[PDB]
């Protein structure tokens, strides 16, 4: 509705019998492959990201925000626990750090 | 010629891989929308008859 | 040729054969007067909406 | 072909030009309408050959390779259910290319989420895409993951009911 | 051609005005398209027609 991409803001400009909108939008770029999982299995419990997504660079698991790569250590502060590991399809084993 | 619809892109889908952006582009685009016309009035009697 | 308008001096370089002039609507816009051969411009009298 | 009629028709001026220009404007407006609706992507996406979407079935909406028209079964049913100086101009986009555009849109929204509509197509597993959509409506991801088989079964049943309802309602 | 949407509206309105002005040059089956010629050539019973 307000340009191609994720809309940030817009500027109006007057035109003869018309209006010109300068739509400022955010476009993602320089994407990178990662190995992802729906949940993390730890201590018999399933951990799900509060706002982000589990990614892996090949050996180590992190959680990052969805629209920008910013890897962080999977802790209890950024994950929540629901159920055991027997239900979620594709759950992987990784440690969950406790601050 | 028969026009092409787009460049062909195959998305590398698999059940455990995701693509995460590592950078961004601030893109400004134009959208032109007409608002009004020229306000024209026609004297019907003068146009038909003078 | 009948009509109503204000007759004024003009700067239109008519060729010798040329007598009158016509606009897009085909109404006469300039005329060459007989007897004196001068070229008179025909400008419609002021009008508009009240 | 009456020449006396056309000689008398020239007395009315440029009425025919106005009618032809209005019809030409309508004719290019139809192609503009189809262009604005269907050509919203400049990349033609395809689904992977293996349809492993975590139990979600899209065969009724993905194109059928066995059909020569390359239409989905739902689109094939939709196309089956619709039945002096005059000329009909063909549309600029054929039905095959409109079906190709819808196939590209379906492949983009299946394999890449809403990311292809805002930029480059970023792949994501479909049970993760669904979880993101669940979080968009305010339901936690765990609810989707725990009940993923039931949600896939409900989605497949609803898609089949859509095809049955279209095939059973005139 | 960046500003074609506004120029399209301007061209359509100017072309409609030009067509409306051009339609005065047509006689529509009458002897002349000029009213003064008809009023100076004919009696009112046929000038009325
Ligand atoms: C995945 O990321 C982690 C963290 O960025 C990497 O682990 C680090 O690797 C560097 C380079 O070998 C070492 O100097 C650090 O000591 C490592 N940190 C830890 C905590 O182990 C890891 O190497 C990355 N893996 C891949 C395949 O890129
Ligand atoms: C993830 O961890 C769980 C628990 O640590 C593993 O489940 C165990 O697997 C072994 C051998 O497969 C069994 O003998 C145990 O009885 C299992 N325990 C439980 C509680 O299920 C699981 O195999 C691990 N998965 C991976 C891929 O390493
Ligand atoms: C993520 O990985 C996939 C597969 O490993 C990459 O897709 C391949 O890209 C190359 C280069 O364009 C093609 O020649 C292959 O045909 C692609 N394979 C498939 C299965 O699509 C993809 O490019 C990677 N993405 C990133 C950002 O590196
Ligand atoms: C993210 O993208 C920007 C450009 O969009 C990169 O900035 C460029 O970096 C190169 C090399 O450092 C410079 O030569 C260019 O002049 C930079 N361009 C601008 C506009 O500043 C930036 O390096 C990228 N960052 C990452 C982490 O990939
Ligand atoms: C996805 O759905 C289609 C149709 O709903 C399934 O195809 C059916 O498969 C069964 C058994 O294999 C056949 O008896 C039916 O005749 C098929 N129907 C059609 C319309 O082809 C398909 O099995 C489902 N699953 C997958 C993985 O594609
Ligand atoms: C993904 O597919 C592989 C086979 O290609 C399978 O081993 C694995 O269990 C699948 N994971 C999920 C979460 O479906
Ligand atoms: C009469 O009109 C002619 C043009 O037909 C012109 O040459 C001549 O000078 C005029 N004479 C007078 C007295 O106006």
What does the block give as tokens for D129?
């895409």
Pick from E19, E22, E29: CB nearest D11 = E29
For D139, other C-beta atoms within 10 Å of its C-beta total 12
What does the block give as tokens for E27?
């006689």
- Interchain CB distance below 8 Å, B12 and D123: yes
Ligand 6 site, residue B17, Cβ cutoff 6 A? no
Query: Cα(first)–Cα(last) distance of chain B, in Å?
Result: 55
CA distance A89 to A79: 18
- C4-19 in b/e form (b: 16+ CB < 10 A) is eeeeeebeeeeeeeee
Of B10, D128, E3, residue with least CA distance to A54: D128
* Cβ neighbours for A15, distance < 8 A, ≥ 6 positions apart: B32, E3, E6
Instruction: For A54, name the nearest residue in chain B, comparing CA atoms only.
Output: B18
Using a CB-CB cut-off of 8 Å, the residues of chain E touching D4 are none
Tell me, yes or no, if C49 comes closer than 8 A to chain B by beta carbon.
yes
- Interchain CB distance below 8 Å, D48 and B14: yes
Q: Name the resolution in angstroms.
A: 2.3
User: For the purposes of burial, counting CB atoms within 10 Å of the CB of A61, is it exposed (0-12), middle (13-18) or buried (19 or more)?
Assistant: buried
Atom of ligand 1 nearest to the CA of A60: 1
CA distance D67 to A44: 49
CA distance C33 to C10: 13
- Give alpha helix (H) positions in chain D: 3-9, 15-38, 73-81, 95-111, 126-136, 141-146, 148-168
What does the block give as tokens for D21?
């220009």
What does the block give as tokens for C24?
């897009």
Window 11-30 of B, Cβ < 8 Å to E:
30
| DSSP 3-state of B26 | strand
What does the block give as tokens for A79?
């994950």
Technique of determination: cryo-EM
């Amino acid at each position: 509705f307000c340009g191609k991409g994720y809309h940030l803001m817009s500027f109006p400009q007057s035109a003869p019998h018309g209006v010109v909108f300068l739509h400022v939008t955010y476009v993602p770029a320089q994407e990178k492959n990662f190995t992802t999982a729906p949940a993390i299995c730890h201590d018999g419990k399933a951990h799900f990201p509060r706002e982000g997504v589990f990614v892996s660079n090949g050996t180590h698991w992190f959680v990052t925000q969805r629209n920008f790569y910013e890897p962080q250590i999977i802790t209890t502060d950024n994950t929540f626990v629901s159920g055991n590991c027997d239900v979620v399809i594709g759950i992987v084993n990784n440690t969950v750090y406790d601050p | 010629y028969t026009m092409s619809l787009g460049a062909e892109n195959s998305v590398a889908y698999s059940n455990n891989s995701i693509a995460i952006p590592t950078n961004f582009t601030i893109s400004v685009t134009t959208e032109i929308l007409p608002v009004s016309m020229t306000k024209t009035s026609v004297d019907c009697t003068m146009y038909i008859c003078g | 040729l009948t009509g109503t308008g204000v007759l004024t001096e003009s700067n239109k370089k008519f060729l010798p054969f040329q007598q009158f002039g016509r606009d897009i609507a085909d109404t006469t816009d300039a005329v060459r007067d007989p007897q004196t051969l001068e070229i008179l411009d025909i400008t419609p009298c002021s009008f508009g909406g009240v | 072909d009456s020449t006396e009629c056309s000689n008398l028709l020239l007395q009315y001026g440029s009425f025919c030009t106005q009618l032809n220009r209005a019809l030409t404007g309508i004719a290019v407006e139809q192609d503009k309408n189809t262009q604005e609706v269907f050509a919203q992507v400049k990349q033609i996406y395809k689904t992977p050959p293996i349809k492993d979407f975590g139990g979600f079935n899209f065969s009724q909406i993905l194109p059928d390779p066995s059909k020569p028209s390359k239409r989905s079964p739902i689109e094939d049913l939709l196309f089956n259910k619709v039945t002096n100086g005059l000329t009909v101009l063909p549309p600029l986009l054929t039905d095959e290319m409109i079906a190709q555009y819808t196939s590209a849109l379906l492949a983009g929204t299946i394999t890449s989420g809403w990311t292809f509509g805002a930029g480059p197509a970023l792949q994501i597993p479909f049970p993760m895409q669904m979880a993101y959509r669940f979080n968009g409506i305010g339901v936690t991801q765990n609810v989707l993951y725990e009940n993923q088989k039931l949600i896939a079964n409900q989605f497949n049943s609803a898609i089949g009911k859509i095809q049955d309802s279209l095939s059973s309602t005139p | 051609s960046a500003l074609g949407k506004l120029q399209d509206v301007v061209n359509q309105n100017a072309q409609a005005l030009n067509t409306l002005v051009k339609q005065l040059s047509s006689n529509f089956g009458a002897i002349s398209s000029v009213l003064n010629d008809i009023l100076s050539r004919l009696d009112p019973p046929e000038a009325e027609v």
